[PDB]
Amino acid sequence: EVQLVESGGGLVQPGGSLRLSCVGSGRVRTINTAGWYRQAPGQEPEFLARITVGGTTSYADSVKGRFTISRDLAKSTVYLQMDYLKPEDTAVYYCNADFDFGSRTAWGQGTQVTVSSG
Numbered sequence: 001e002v003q004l005v006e007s008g009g010g011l012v013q014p015g016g017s018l019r020l021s022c023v024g025s026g027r028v029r030t031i032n033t034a035g036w037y038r039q040a041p042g043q044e045p046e047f048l049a050r051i052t053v054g055g056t057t058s059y060a061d062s063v064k065g066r067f068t069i070s071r072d073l074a075k076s077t078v079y080l081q082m083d084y085l086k087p088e089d090t091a092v093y094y095c096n097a098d099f100d101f102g103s104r105t106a107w108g109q110g111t112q113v114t115v116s117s118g
């Protein structure tokens with residue numbers, strides 16, 4: 001059993017940066033990959049970034065060059081560094097983790113990211 005706790009959302013101006021954290025607890029040794037997703041109101045979730053235990057990363061085209069996914073195995077934490085945020089990036093961001101040989105999946109509770117000048 002794996003649980004995911006997220007943090008780091010909030011308000012940010014266009015062009016600003018935020019870092020999201022995805023802290024894993026439980027049988028974290030079984031986690032194979034972890035990914036970042038986002039969902040806007042009334043839309044399907046959108047894949048953003050993926051990372052394996054070895055550190056291999058994969059990105060969606062909408063965030064390449066701006067977002068960086070990383071993982072700290074000692075802390076069981078997956079990070080999403082989001083640079084040059086745009087109003088289009090406003091959504092609730094979720095992290096997932098595939099564990100038990102990629103046969104189980106756990107989702108974080110989500111964190112709201114709003115890109116606005118006010």
Ligand SMILES: CCOP(=S)(OCC)Oc1ccc2c(C)c(Cl)c(=O)oc2c1
Nearest residue numbers: 024029031034052053071072073076077
């Ligand atoms: C949401 C947290 O995700 P992460 S940092 O994994 C991202 C892919 O979870 C871990 C953390 C530690 C380990 C260790 C020590 C071993 Cl030996 C292993 O096989 O898998 C791990 C997976």
